[PDB]
Design a protein around this motif. Structure first.
Motif, mmCIF file in Angstrom:
data_model
loop_
_atom_site.group_PDB
_atom_site.id
_atom_site.type_symbol
_atom_site.label_atom_id
_atom_site.label_comp_id
_atom_site.label_asym_id
_atom_site.label_seq_id
_atom_site.Cartn_x
_atom_site.Cartn_y
_atom_site.Cartn_z
ATOM 1 N N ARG A 11 46.821 49.225 54.193
ATOM 2 C CA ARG A 11 47.244 49.754 52.895
ATOM 3 C C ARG A 11 48.703 49.432 52.582
ATOM 4 O O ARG A 11 49.213 49.827 51.531
ATOM 5 C CB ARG A 11 47.075 51.270 52.838
ATOM 6 C CG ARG A 11 45.652 51.789 52.966
ATOM 7 C CD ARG A 11 45.690 53.306 52.866
ATOM 8 N NE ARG A 11 44.526 53.935 53.473
ATOM 9 C CZ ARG A 11 44.602 54.926 54.353
ATOM 10 N NH1 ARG A 11 45.790 55.391 54.723
ATOM 11 N NH2 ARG A 11 43.496 55.459 54.851
ATOM 12 N N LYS A 226 35.141 45.784 46.554
ATOM 13 C CA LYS A 226 36.346 46.483 46.112
ATOM 14 C C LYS A 226 36.087 47.352 44.877
ATOM 15 O O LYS A 226 36.773 48.356 44.655
ATOM 16 C CB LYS A 226 37.469 45.480 45.832
ATOM 17 C CG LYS A 226 37.912 44.697 47.071
ATOM 18 C CD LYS A 226 38.224 45.619 48.256
ATOM 19 C CE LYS A 226 39.330 46.626 47.928
ATOM 20 N NZ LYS A 226 39.756 47.417 49.123
ATOM 21 N N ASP A 227 35.106 46.968 44.069
ATOM 22 C CA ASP A 227 34.770 47.764 42.887
ATOM 23 C C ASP A 227 34.037 49.009 43.364
ATOM 24 O O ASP A 227 34.231 50.093 42.830
ATOM 25 C CB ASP A 227 33.846 47.006 41.934
ATOM 26 C CG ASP A 227 34.549 45.900 41.187
ATOM 27 O OD1 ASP A 227 35.785 45.975 41.028
ATOM 28 O OD2 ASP A 227 33.855 44.961 40.743
ATOM 29 N N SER A 229 34.293 50.508 46.373
ATOM 30 C CA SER A 229 35.109 51.442 47.149
ATOM 31 C C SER A 229 36.488 50.910 47.515
ATOM 32 O O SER A 229 36.715 49.697 47.515
ATOM 33 C CB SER A 229 34.344 51.788 48.438
ATOM 34 O OG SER A 229 35.145 52.497 49.365
ATOM 35 N N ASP A 230 37.401 51.821 47.847
ATOM 36 C CA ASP A 230 38.743 51.411 48.246
ATOM 37 C C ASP A 230 38.775 51.101 49.743
ATOM 38 O O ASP A 230 39.831 50.779 50.292
ATOM 39 C CB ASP A 230 39.780 52.494 47.927
ATOM 40 C CG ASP A 230 39.989 52.684 46.438
ATOM 41 O OD1 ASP A 230 39.625 51.778 45.658
ATOM 42 O OD2 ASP A 230 40.534 53.737 46.050
ATOM 43 N N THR A 231 37.618 51.199 50.395
ATOM 44 C CA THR A 231 37.516 50.892 51.823
ATOM 45 C C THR A 231 38.131 49.511 52.024
ATOM 46 O O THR A 231 37.761 48.564 51.334
ATOM 47 C CB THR A 231 36.039 50.821 52.293
ATOM 48 O OG1 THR A 231 35.418 52.104 52.151
ATOM 49 C CG2 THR A 231 35.960 50.375 53.754
ATOM 50 N N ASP A 253 41.617 42.843 51.538
ATOM 51 C CA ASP A 253 42.843 43.539 51.904
ATOM 52 C C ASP A 253 43.521 42.773 53.027
ATOM 53 O O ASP A 253 44.732 42.855 53.196
ATOM 54 C CB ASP A 253 42.525 44.964 52.333
ATOM 55 C CG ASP A 253 41.987 45.776 51.194
ATOM 56 O OD1 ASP A 253 42.797 46.219 50.355
ATOM 57 O OD2 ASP A 253 40.755 45.934 51.116
#
Lengths: 336, 337
Positions: A11, A226-227, A229-231, A253
């Protein structure tokens, strides 16, 4: 989890050490792994045994002290629900059997790989020390595995199929892309903290073919994830130096790369997260060499976040556990 | 020679069309090649037979109509004068035997590979249709063959030698670099119009290891050749996308690259000559695919010179002569707009 270095790093948040986990950290080089593996003859059966799979997934945490657990499974499991016979021949590798006719494949039903989601949940409840990584093979790699029937040294069939039968190639890539998407969505729903896409066989392709026949599908797959989830999503690919300029376009990411690239330099050129990339073979050398090559790389990393240490590929069955642990500890104790 | 498209292209001069030649253009896929090979006991003997090596060297010219001839030889021949036993077991591959101790290698005497320079001379005397290419293996690739005792498929021993014994690695690379330098120089004196350095096995190295343990030696090798003669120098290397940014620093006239890079794009970012880079496997496909893959590449080449078409690696012994002929003619018939 008590330890969230992996998540914070992905992140882009502050971290006091670089997180480390190794591909195939749960494997045959580990005495404890072999003992469990010996209880269930058939590997596919082992992958479906929730108890044993959970136990294996946890081994790296206890034995190596790595910063993350990757669930024990195989990239080929989603193929079985398609109607493909999946078998593993001891010391021979996987064998995939099917008519070779894309239309004979059955529409993917994610619930048919339920055991994988059950393992993720079980692993999340068995320990709260580190994040849990879910995974799937990338569309091209699964397509090639299927076309080659499980293994190949030349990948001629894959190439001829791709070049001479673009209609069926697209048809199959669409099926596998949607299958991997649905499969991964269920893993995230089950509690996976991170998901990694393995495109281990793309190094067999020319840059030209990767861009025309693979890129479109991977870009779609990762964007859709990515759409959803933010996983964090990690995309691993061999022949990294060849495809890196295209791969940075993905909404991944982090890009897990091999030793054909220099991560310290990539961080200076691209605004992206990177994982890797020690050549596994370095583990065959003396600890002195392992130390210089490993610390030599860590000292050159120009950022303080968005980096995850790992090898450029998976650990081999014949590497020494003592040296593998030594490597993990060099990273774990390296001050930022 | 009557056709000097290859040289004009390499020198960046105007050319009517792109020149083409193929690595391993002379091989068992040609019947005449097979008949000549059966005339001699061993493969090393064949390389030392000036009459027959010259005959083989000429076959691609007559059969394929390629724009250049590369002398028939092997990259392992200069290792013999160093005191290493070089064998070619048919069906298994090359086998190199030596103590493993650098101090046991003998001082290289270039005259010991005289047959190679005689072939160059004989080939130039035998035809005046196209340029002749001399060649040698690059120091790292030769070192890997020496450490692996032949082929490996993992180069574990090469890597351990390189990482754990840097002193002996340097000593050996110094020897091999000077050996290759002197050997190539003799080929130039003998009449080679171009010289190509083959670094076939560096793809087994990480980018950092190439930069630290290979780059210095190849840079020296090439700069010394260029100081010696204006003869065009081509540096061939696998794992092209990995080492390309370093390789462009060499004073090579052209970089022969594989299919891991896109030559049209390379010409737009680097001021260098390029050779290649069709994936050999395309030849296993239908002529329709070969046509589409080849013309697809040619039509995107942005420059009008400093380009030489070739494969990204040598032809495989089992590729079809008819399809290889097709590819060569496809390139020769491409109009330069």
């Amino acid at each position: 989890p008590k330890n969230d270095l992996l998540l914070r790093s992905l992140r882009g948040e502050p971290i006091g050490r670089f997180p480390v986990w190794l591909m195939r950290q749960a494997g045959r080089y580990m005495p404890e792994y072999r003992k469990i593996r010996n209880r269930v003859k058939n590997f596919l059966e082992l992958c479906k045994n929730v108890d044993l799979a959970t136990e294996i997934s946890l081994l790296p945490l206890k034995i190596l002290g790595v910063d993350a657990i990757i669930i024990f499974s195989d990239i080929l499991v989603p193929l079985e629900p398609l109607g493909v016979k999946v078998e593993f021949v001891e010391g021979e590798g996987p064998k995939l059997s099917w008519s070779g006719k894309v239309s004979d494949l059955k529409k993917y039903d994610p619930s048919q790989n339920a055991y994988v989601y059950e393992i993720i949940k079980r692993v999340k409840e068995a320990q709260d020390e580190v994040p849990v990584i879910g995974f799937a093979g990338a569309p091209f790699t699964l397509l090639s595995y299927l076309i080659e029937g499980g293994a190949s040294k030349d990948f001629k069939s894959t190439k001829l199929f791709m070049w001479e039968n673009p209609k069926e190639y697209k048809r199959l890539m669409d099926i596998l892309t949607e299958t991997v998407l649905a499969y991964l969505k269920e893993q995230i729903k089950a509690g996976a903290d991170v998901v990694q896409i393995f495109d281990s066989w793309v190094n067999n392709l020319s840059l030209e073919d990767y861009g025309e026949y693979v890129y479109p599908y991977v870009n779609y797959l990762i964007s859709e994830l990515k759409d959803f989830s933010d996983t964090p999503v990690i995309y691993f690919f061999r022949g990294s130096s060849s495809f890196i300029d295209l791969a940075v376009d993905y909404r991944a990411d982090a890009l897990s790369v091999d030793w054909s690239v220099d991560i310290p330099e990539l961080f200076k050129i691209y605004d992206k997260g990177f994982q890797g990339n020690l050549e596994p073979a370095v583990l065959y050398a003396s600890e002195e060499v392992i130390e210089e090559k490993t610390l030599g790389l860590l000292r050159r990393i120009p950022v303080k976040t968005r980096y995850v240490f790992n090898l450029g590929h998976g650990l081999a069955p014949d590497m020494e556990l003592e040296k593998v642990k030594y490597l993990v500890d060099l990273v774990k104790s390296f001050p930022l």
